[PDB]
């Protein structure tokens, strides 16, 4: 049978492999007829230059538009032949091509997925088809208040580093961008060790590694230099920005404080805190009886329509903070009742309340692993991140670290008496002037 | 590990279970009472009933629940459709029993306190609003209203004049009528059969009574048009397909994947879909077309839901519509048939793999059949689809009465007589 500790123990473990030129392999076997095959590259925006800015998201489109061996829309008709779905997406630190397909068709799968990564037909017929679509998306993307307001947040905190910039880059580059830079950008960042292959499904390991093998052994995917590694720590600028617009009905806010990177012990402690403060939304069936002290109050009077806490960790850096929507007369009262929470944690926290935080994390961590792709997707970033480690059962072992004195020693670092980063989007007007917030981070014991 | 063990009771309530290796352990409970069981004076009840899960049980205060569940770190869900309401609940390997304890009390031992009902009233509007931001919702609910008379046309949401009209009695009656031990199905996943098998027989045995089936839904013609300021027309065009559990109900599913286009490649305009392609040739810049198929117990509908601008709307329909006639004229390609069936197998298997997604399809058979069908059987049933059958089936769509709904600026919209 299965007991909580026992259920950790029987899982197909990580497999690992190398090729000669620095490509990696890894996998797992779920005894399942379907499989995810994918690719995860670390080539981000924070590498790209001021002229190359946005090229990454630009390239991201062209791949499926037809390629060296299989011209435009000959490629897709083979994917739709298998009936396999096909997907790609980008992120500031990562780029991912992957496929969900039956275990059977895997022989073509990689050999298809192989080609797209490197050989790409680049035809200005496609470019002008593309250069519109982006200049179509930019102007629309104003329509979503959420995605925007973040692009405020980075730029305001990180100003002066390659990380401080938009994914898609300013509009003007989209016009001027020529496939010269692309080929250069192509040439630079797509070699191994950067690249990583992964998969999960009916595959095991061996039957993959042979059909890992030959292109890409491979088309290289090389290793020379490209210097090393274009990367460098980034500054933290305590600042503010306000786009004050009084037309719109509601007023977003985001407040944040800087935090550690991927691999670090404190990364776990803070995972738990932001579970405890919890989150509320208009439409829950919670009511006024919820446990989360901001889900009881802000549900009572609907001080804010909804808010969630986010946690983002970059290579050497991470962001902590919340995102809340509320009506303009109400905005003050969130800010106070918010800073109540962070400050009652860093002093007055308690053993009992920890548990309800601790449990949920065990819950979400596990339920995050249902399904083929969510597993595979994890494996991809992990290798680039913590190395090979997929420390599943170890997670639990790392959790029991958490104790009362653990939390209050952790959060005493990053919260009490710091410089926040505020970014907001109108009708902001009542949002207090800066020197209030800074004077609201540290209790005087009131 | 072990495969599906489903056990009738004398009571008739199906139970089934598996034993997993995972710390994930989840339970579900399905009931046959959906929207189709609301009556004229009975409207809007189910859509209230679905929000009341947190109210005070018979034995436990509404407070002790909500703090209780979260302390464990559990999660409670509710789901409805036009047919089967399902209370889903999930937690860690260990704690299920305390949580298995609450699941009954909610559905087994309700109490509706008039002072705890009235406070919840305003919630509906907040709920109803965020639902209709996607008009692709709001188009559908009109559609059923056009294509029926008595039952299925009922909304999943509470009409507005009906808001202050919900009395506790109405609830407390609709509770016991359409809840009964014959109509319920309890499904575990990660838990041993016997533990599950024990408690269910105890609490969930009540009557008897009432399945009242009086809804034949009586498909009947009609159409609905609506004029709003929005600049993007939506359109649906539907004829009556056949009921679930038929090679036809299988055949239509074959037919859609031929025409029916979900995006299989991000940003890729689907070239394999004859429909979206057959249009784009003779027409202009943005639009969208997709086939639409859903099947219920006594009947199911088939059609295609389109989106365009105000000018193109007239042509988009006529273009796509005649394109179907081509197929009804005998035009066919066996490879596409062979290709489509592959998509179907793909679409189905990838759909099932996820536990929750798997969990739903389990009982979906249960309340309908009462058995379990391994996916292999599904597969072998898939390829049984004949070519002329597909054609002949599509020959029914064109050859039979149709219905429509449209929401937006209608200035150029055709009517069902021009088609």
């Amino acid at each position: 049978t299965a007991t909580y500790a026992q259920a950790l123990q029987s899982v197909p473990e990580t497999q690992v492999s190398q090729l000669d030129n620095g490509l990696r392999v890894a996998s797992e076997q779920s005894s399942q007829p379907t499989c995810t095959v994918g690719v995860w590259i670390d080539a981000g925006s924070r590498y790209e230059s001021e002229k190359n800015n946005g090229a990454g998201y630009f390239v991201e489109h062209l791949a499926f538009k037809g390629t060296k061996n299989r011209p435009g829309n000959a490629l897709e008709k083979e994917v739709e032949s298998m009936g396999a779905h096909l997907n790609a997406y980008s992120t500031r630190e990562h780029t991912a091509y992957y496929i969900k397909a039956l275990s059977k068709d895997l022989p073509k799968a990689v050999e298809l997925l192989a080609d797209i990564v490197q050989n790409c037909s680049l035809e200005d017929s496609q470019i002008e088809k593309e250069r519109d679509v982006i200049l179509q998306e930019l102007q629309e993307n104003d329509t979503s208040m959420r995605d925007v307001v973040f692009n405020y947040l980075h730029a305001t905190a990180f100003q002066g580093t390659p990380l401080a910039q938009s994914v898609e880059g300013p509009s003007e580059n989209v016009r001027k961008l020529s496939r010269a830079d692309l080929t250069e950008y192509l040439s630079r960042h797509y070699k191994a060790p950067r690249m990583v292959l992964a998969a999960a499904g009916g595959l095991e390991h061996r039957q993959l590694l042979d059909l890992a093998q030959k292109h890409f052994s491979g088309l290289s995917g090389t290793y020379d230099e490209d210097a090393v590694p274009t990367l460098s720590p980034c500054r933290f600028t305590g600042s503010q920005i306000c786009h004050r617009e009084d037309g719109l009905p509601l007023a977003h806010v985001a407040i944040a404080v800087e935090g550690p990177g991927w691999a670090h012990p404190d990364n776990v402690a803070l995972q738990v805190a932001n579970a405890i403060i919890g989150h509320y939304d208009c439409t829950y069936g919670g009511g006024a009886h919820l446990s989360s002290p901001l889900a009881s109050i802000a549900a009572t009077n609907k001080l804010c329509q909804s808010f969630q806490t986010f946690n983002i960790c970059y290579a050497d850096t991470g962001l902590l903070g919340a995102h809340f929507v509320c009506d303009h007369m109400s905005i003050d009262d969130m800010m106070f009742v918010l800073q109540g929470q962070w400050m009652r944690l860093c002093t007055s926290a308690t053993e009992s309340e920890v548990l309800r935080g601790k449990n949920l994390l065990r819950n979400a961590l596990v339920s995050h692993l249902d399904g083929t792709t969510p597993v595979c997707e994890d494996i991809g970033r992990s290798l680039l991140t913590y190395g090979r480690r997929i420390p599943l059962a170890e997670w639990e072992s790392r959790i029991a670290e958490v104790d009362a004195r653990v939390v209050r020693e952790v959060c005493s670092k990053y919260f009490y008496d710091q410089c926040p980063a505020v970014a907001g989007f109108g009708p902001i007007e009542q949002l207090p002037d800066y020197n209030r917030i800074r004077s609201g981070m540290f209790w005087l014991r009131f | 590990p072990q495969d599906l063990e489903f056990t009738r009771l004398p009571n008739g309530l199906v139970i089934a279970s598996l034993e997993n290796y995972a710390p994930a352990s989840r339970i579900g409970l399905f009931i046959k009472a959906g929207s189709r069981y609301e009556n004229s004076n009975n409207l809007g009840t189910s859509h209230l009933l679905r929000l009341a899960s947190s109210l005070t049980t018979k034995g436990a205060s509404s407070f002790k629940i909500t703090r209780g569940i979260e302390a464990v770190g559990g999660k409670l869900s509710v789901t409805s459709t036009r047919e089967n309401m399902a209370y889903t609940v999930e937690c860690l390997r260990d704690d299920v029993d305390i949580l298995m304890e609450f699941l009954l009390n909610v559905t087994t031992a309700p109490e509706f306190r008039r002072w705890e009902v009235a406070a919840l009233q305003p919630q509906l509007r907040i709920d109803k609003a965020v639902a209709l931001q996607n008009p692709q919702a709001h188009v559908i609910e009109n559609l059923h209203a056009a294509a029926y008379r008595n039952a299925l046309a009922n909304s999943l949401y509470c009409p507005d004049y009906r808001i202050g009209k919900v009395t506790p009695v109405e609830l407390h009656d609709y509770v016991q009528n359409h809840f009964t031990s014959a109509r319920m199905a309890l499904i575990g996943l990660g838990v041993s059969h016997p533990v599950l098998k024990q408690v269910a027989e105890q609490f969930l045995n009540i009557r008897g009574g009432l399945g009242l089936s009086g809804a034949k839904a009586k498909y009947h013609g009609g159409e609905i048009r609506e004029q709003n300021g929005d600049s993007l027309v939506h359109a649906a065009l539907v004829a009556e397909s056949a009921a679930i559990g038929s090679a036809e109900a299988n055949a239509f599913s074959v037919l859609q994947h031929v025409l029916g286009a979900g995006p299989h490649v991000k940003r890729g305009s689907n070239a394999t879909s004859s429909l979206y392609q057959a249009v784009a040739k003779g027409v202009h810049q943005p639009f969208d077309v997709s086939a639409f198929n859903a099947s219920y117990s006594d009947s199911g509908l088939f059609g295609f839901y389109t989106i365009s601008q105000a000018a193109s709307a007239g042509d988009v329909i006529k273009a796509a519509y005649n394109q179907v006639k081509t197929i009804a004229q005998g035009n066919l390609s066996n490879p596409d048939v062979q290709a489509a069936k592959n998509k179907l197998k793909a679409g189905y298997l990838m759909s099932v793999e996820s536990s929750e997604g798997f969990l739903d399809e389990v009982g979906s058979q249960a309340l309908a059949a009462g058995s379990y069908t391994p996916p292999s059987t599904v597969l072998q049933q898939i390829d049984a689809v004949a070519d002329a059958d597909v054609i002949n089936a599509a020959k029914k769509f064109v050859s039979g009465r149709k219905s429509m709904a449209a929401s937006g600026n209608l200035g150029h919209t055709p009517f069902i007589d021009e088609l």
Binding site: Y284, G285 | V78, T81, I140, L156, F292, Y305
Partner: peptide, 18 residues
């Protein structure tokens, strides 16, 4: 198309589908 549709009320999250 659609399922046709669905609704999810529950407690901790909330949403609608199709």
């Amino acid at each position: 198309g659609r399922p046709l549709v669905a609704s999810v009320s529950l407690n901790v999250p909330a949403s609608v589908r199709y």
